[PDB]
Design a protein around this ligand. Structure first.
Ligand SMILES: O=c1[nH]c(=O)n([C@@H]2O[C@H](CO)[C@@H](O)[C@H](O)[C@H]2O)cc1Cl
Ligand SMILES: O=c1[nH]c(=O)n([C@@H]2O[C@H](CO)[C@@H](O)[C@H](O)[C@H]2O)cc1Cl
Lengths: 810, 810
């Protein structure tokens, strides 16, 4: 049907049909008469996976022969979503599969909806890892994603009486056709034990053993025949484990609980033992495999020329003392050389400056669990603080601030400090965030070693986030400029010369309208929810967090409602306001914010005076596959964190790529987005970082906004008095209380400028042609925010490898 | 190579090689350069499974079309062993695979040794189920084996310092290519809850739900293109399960512990909650599937014409009140009709008369776990005891003996009594065992309803137990008489006319010698153990149990040793005595018997005076695949249970089929074996059942044997005084104590006749020609003990179906 979806050759289609039928019969052990759509999905999924494997085997052999430097991306999170369409897209098989399945009398889109998301992440950080893997393979780097094969990913979210309820995401119930179990490469991981000293050094003894079993999933590059590997570890008990006989066998579960479940706290640290076991487990098993692979090239000096390890936040920071443990205790390198090797090998990415998100592990945990790694960390700390002392003689307060060991009621190890000490590069994830790091939390480190500190502004893969989810927009772009922009997103700049082309204006607005019609219909069929598709689609989707200020969004919605009630017969640009996202299970305030959002819809959506001029919809179970449907339907993107708190953001980029305009603070990557499109083509409002600090010094007093803004006071009074919760009049007193007295994120300070900026958006919306021209201006300047540009900077400036767009042979 | 192994056609071989290579590449994602033998096994296993599926699908469709009466074989045990060679054999693919793999430069036998046993049973009862499934499909019956997919089968046994040590049998580590997960047919099973009464009857409410997920494994008949199904259930948690969030997710394991592990107690009842959950789980899930399948034929009168359910011991006896629960509470049939349907549907097989092996569940368990099934069982008991009262008016003692409810400190439900009440047929497993049932434990039942009681003497599948494990013997048999005996074992009778054929005598003795040479070499390569292959191979392999009297065997071995020490220069027929078998984990005496056997080898095997005239070897980890190697190497089969205790035995048949002679008591099927071959062709010794009762009346006094038999006294003194345990002189005082004072099985009473009968065996062994002629006489009369004859009797006399040897189309 559409051009960027590849060829449907006679030979290809005929072949696909036969392999589809072979898998239906032989693999599924089904006959056409009892197959359900789910069986058809599987037959298709196995048929497409067949095309990968040859490429998978030849890529992995090519690396063994040529021996390039390898990149190991360690992360506790890989938010992959679905694999089928992405694989079709990267292999140019999409039109052929469509044809082949159409001829068997099936609808490929129906089938794609049956695939479970691999929800092995929480949000922005785990999805960055996913975009990165795709960019690494598109750019021909010999790169391996390593993590944990969680048996339950992020919980599925149900809304019940307006409240979030969690349920287990049993994503593997029906099998995962994409993975290949690799029990032959099972590896031991050690916990507990104690440290013995011999004449030949330290020895870690009496440990419990958990085996790590690898599962490999292929990662295809974009039409370059590269297929890289994501290797995820699964925990297994050893066979002599505790070996009532019956009880001994059942207790094997204690060991395998390590890979059972993903911790669902985003931007919040929970110091629980099970988490730290997961952290050590991925790092222990990954480093043996790395070293094994290196020894099949004695000489560790060349280790940093053959290996790069990227640490995705501090989660795998135990890689640093573990690499020392292996080099010093097992290989018998001396300390100083092991340390040189380790620093040259590791690099660390920070994703936050929020105090509560930083990992600081109680020393009593590390002591019990990892008594040798604690010893190594104290030694790292001592040698490091000696370099500090030597450089800032006398500055005792610097020593206590810079220490890897925090003193206090419970001593803690500050894992970020460890990473900066043992890495040759540390980077933030947007220009402003990187600057904040150097001026604030890591200032002392920066003065010590300014040359470690870098920026690598985040990006998103244009494959998933454009070609896969928005074929209509990819297609009209490609009619004008060709196809090359898909792996060179800077080419979108050529679209600037079409800003005054009447036919192009009309095709952009037409693609948006179609996407909105398709999303409106997904809403009714799957959730009996009922919307005007001519309305402006105002969307805020991301994890529920106070800093993300969904509450600010809420106050705007209530203000619009109150302005309609006050003058019902006055015209307003109609909106569909959609907010979506998961709250972590113990984050009480996040759960209250969800409940408020639904309580608002309850009032607003059934007010007959409002008509279809205002609807508030909470999007349930937001996740990757739902992002792919809603983002291309969006007209307005809400990116309204308090300035200084959102390290980068990446939703913001997905929306800009897909023809939504942005309303945002100068936060994170919003700053670079605006600078790329021109501030005139962006709806910026509210405090800058500088303004927030000024306010923090005087002191933030919210009563002051409440006394001066009648519209705001009326909302607060409606909240306290039970207007949004008539049977529980005090339902929301926690929120009101927090907003009035304990608001770390200054919702009231930005309210006024936010509302006025919201009027400027409705006004452009009234002028379709001029809305669409600003849209083209955004789309056209989104090139920088491709993950291919990001990974190329990592590769050149951190890993020391040269990207390559050259096809490997078929 | 050999004729009964099928054709190696050019076209077939060429095809196998290509599919082998396809699976290596696409399924295994390996290249020839890194494949290990284990990968080659898998490529072969998938290539052979491809040939099954077409037949599997067409068999299952043929039953749906024709709708014959279906047989449901319920068992908690299916001792399958390996599947690959058996599948090749039943599909006539064996020579072709041999050829095809030989041309890829591989050794098929090497590959077969990589397959794990499916050890989902304990011994004779779970292996009977396995032979039965094979016979049911060979005979074209529409039959389904239902049980439990245990994640850990019988433990692997290691001997350490002479002691058994257990370890978990992680048989699924590398995947099971034979099974097909069927998550689409997942079913709910209920536990706990309470019973409510409405105006519309009883209702079972507030239950916990465990899902049962089915895994299907194909069961091929012998060259008839029938492939039946073994469906095994796996326990899964529901998704809202308990739904700390983290803890809620981890506790999903409590539910899935139901299918985690096979209970390893054989012939001994352990009344543990986890066991009863397993029992209910298999029965609950199986009956829904049965009823589902029946409703795709409203009218329950025809239920017994469409369904037979065979109960393998009392383990699935909850089928009886569950079928009532479904008919009466769910379908709203009235009691009396539901009961007629249930009786006409169920039949029960007993496998033991040992008091300690019978299931008697505490009422407080059933009450908590299954409160509705307890109610139904009390109602069954009351109506049943009313029929007894009506028939034997006044006989109060009969009422208490026959009750399903045993009174006592804890009230118990006697599950055998339940089965006899709710089944139209009850059967023992050998003629003498069936007689004992009617004269003793079930006498009262027999007088009430004599027409329920039947015999179905056990059998073994000649496929596995002859063609698969003994190709050499199958082959010389087939040269003379053709191939038809493989599915008509009565034809072996024709071999009687070759008893005086010199060439045949020599080919039987040659096959035995070769098997012994191959087993001698398996012993050295895999266990550094060192034997004379010219010796008589004296073998007792079966679970370690006091009633099986491995101790009697032990005393004989010590007597031979002592006779050698007393006259070293006198000639004796040399023997290799091999004893093997697993002891259940808490059975202390069974573990001591293993330790004695090794302690004896320790003395005997290193006595330089003994030379290679006597060796005692404990065969470690006895299981199905080890049975297939040792049984055709055996010259002498030890079947020496105290008469009246071994219900049938089936090892005894495997040995007789494979050219070992039998030394045995008149116990179980030994009685019919001797009657088939002629008592002259069998080494029978010791008490008959009648003699045992006579001894029980006077009272068994072991001191009497010890005072009258000097050879026996010397053994006991050597045991007490530390001769077999010099560093622990009192190691064996438990055994001596038991033998002297508390021997339920009368080891001393049979000692004398056993030793003298052991001399008669050595004497025939001295005359190879005459040994071999008696062997031919056994082999030739083994036809009765085929499982095809057994299943044909079940089918005709119990299930009401007609077997058929007709091929389904290819
Ligand atoms: O726990 C976390 N989870 C997460 O999604 N991020 C995000 O990481 C994203 C990727 O860097 C980034 O765009 C966004 O600004 C961050 O909030 C950071 C932490 Cl520390
Ligand atoms: O728990 C058991 N396990 C077992 O193997 N059998 C055997 O069942 C075998 C099959 O009927 C039979 O030959 C043998 O005589 C029995 O001991 C019986 C019980 Cl009750």
């Amino acid at each position: 049907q559409i051009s960027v979806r590849g060829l449907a050759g006679v030979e290809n289609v005929t072949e696909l049909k036969k392999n589809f039928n072979r898998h239906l019969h032989f693999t599924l052990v089904k006959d056409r008469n009892v197959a359900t759509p789910r069986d058809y999905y599987f037959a298709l999924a196995h048929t497409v996976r067949d095309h990968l494997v040859g490429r998978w085997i030849r890529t992995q052999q090519h690396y063994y022969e040529k021996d390039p430097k390898r990149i190991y991306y360690l992360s506790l999170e890989f938010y992959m979503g679905r694999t089928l369409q992405n694989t079709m897209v990267n292999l140019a098989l999409e039109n052929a599969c469509d044809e082949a399945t159409y001829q068997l009398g099936l609808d490929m889109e129906e089938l794609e909806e049956i695939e479970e998301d691999a929800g092995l992440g929480n949000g922005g950080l785990g999805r960055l890892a996913a975009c990165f893997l795709d960019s690494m393979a598109t750019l021909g780097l010999a790169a391996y994603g390593y993590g944990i094969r969680y048996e339950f990913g992020i919980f599925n979210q149900k809304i019940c009486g307006g409240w979030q309820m969690e349920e287990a995401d049993d994503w593997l119930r029906y099998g995962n056709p994409w993975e290949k179990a690799r029990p032959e490469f099972t590896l031991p991981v050690h916990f507990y034990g104690r440290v013995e000293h011999t004449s030949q050094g330290a020895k870690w003894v009496d440990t419990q053993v958990v085996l790590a079993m690898p599962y490999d999933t292929p990662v295809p590059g974009y039409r370059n025949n590269v297929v890289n590997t994501m290797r995820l570890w699964s925990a297994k008990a050893p066979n002599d484990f505790n070996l009532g006989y019956i009880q001994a066998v059942l207790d094997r579960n204690l060991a395998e609980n390590i890979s059972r479940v993903l911790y669902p706290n985003d931007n919040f640290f929970e110091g629980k033992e099970l988490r730290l076991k997961q952290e050590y487990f991925v790092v222990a098993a990954t480093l043996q495999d790395i070293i094994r692979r290196f020894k099949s090239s004695t000489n560790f000096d060349a280790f940093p020329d053959k290996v790069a390890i990227q640490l995705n936040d501090t989660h795998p920071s135990l890689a640093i003392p573990e690499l020392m443990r292996v080099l010093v205790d097992l290989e018998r390198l001396d300390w100083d050389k092991a340390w040189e090797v380790t620093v040259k090998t590791c690099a660390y990415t920070n994703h936050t400056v929020l105090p509560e998100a930083l990992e600081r592990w109680p020393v009593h945990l590390l002591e019990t669990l990892l008594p040798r790694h604690l010893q190594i960390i104290y030694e790292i700390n001592q040698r490091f603080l000696n370099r500090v002392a030597a450089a800032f003689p006398g500055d005792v307060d610097r020593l206590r601030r810079m220490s890897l060991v925090e003193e206090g009621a419970v001593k803690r190890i500050n894992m970020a400090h460890l990473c900066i000490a043992g890495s040759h590069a540390v980077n933030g994830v947007a220009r402003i965030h990187s600057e904040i790091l150097k001026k604030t939390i890591f200032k002392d480190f920066y003065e010590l070693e300014p040359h470690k500190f870098q920026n690598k502004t985040n990006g998103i893969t244009p494959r998933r986030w454009l070609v896969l989810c928005n074929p209509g927009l990819a297609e009209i772009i490609a009619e004008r400029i060709g196809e090359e922009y898909i792996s060179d997103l800077d080419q979108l700049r050529k679209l600037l010369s079409y800003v005054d082309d009447e036919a192009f204006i009309r095709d952009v607005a037409k693609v948006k309208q179609e996407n909105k019609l398709k999303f409106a219909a997904y809403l009714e069929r799957e959730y009996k929810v009922h919307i005007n598709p001519n309305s402006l689609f105002d969307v805020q989707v991301k994890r529920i967090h106070e800093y993300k200020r969904q509450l600010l969004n809420c106050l705007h919605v209530i203000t619009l409602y109150n302005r309609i009630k006050k003058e019902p017969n006055k015209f307003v640009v109609p909106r569909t306001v959609m907010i979506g996202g998961k709250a972590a299970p113990g984050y009480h305030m996040a759960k209250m914010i969800i409940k408020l959002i639904t309580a608002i819809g309850d009032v607003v959506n059934h007010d007959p005076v409002v008509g279809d001029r205002l609807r508030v919809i909470f999007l349930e179970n937001y996740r990757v596959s739902l992002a792919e449907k809603v983002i291309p339907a969006a007209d307005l993107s809400e990116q309204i964190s308090t300035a200084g708190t959102e390290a980068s953001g990446t939703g913001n980029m997905k929306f800009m790529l897909n023809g939504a305009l942005t309303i945002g603070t100068m936060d994170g990557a919003n700053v670079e987005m605006a600078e790329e499109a021109g501030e005139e083509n962006f709806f910026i409002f509210g405090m800058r970082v500088e303004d927030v600090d000024r306010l923090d010094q005087r002191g933030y007093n919210a009563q002051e906004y409440y006394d001066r803004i009648p519209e705001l006071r009326q909302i607060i009074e409606q909240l306290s008095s039970g207007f949004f919760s008539p049977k529980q009049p005090d339902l929301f007193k926690d929120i009101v209380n927090m907003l009035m007295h304990h608001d770390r994120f200054k919702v009231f300070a930005d309210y006024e400028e936010y509302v006025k900026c919201q009027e400027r958006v409705s006004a452009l919306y009234k002028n379709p042609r001029e809305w669409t021209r600003m849209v083209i201006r955004n789309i056209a300047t989104s090139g920088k925010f491709s993950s291919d540009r990001t990974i190329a900077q990592y590769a050149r400036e951190i890993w020391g490898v040269e990207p390559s767009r050259q096809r490997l042979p078929a």
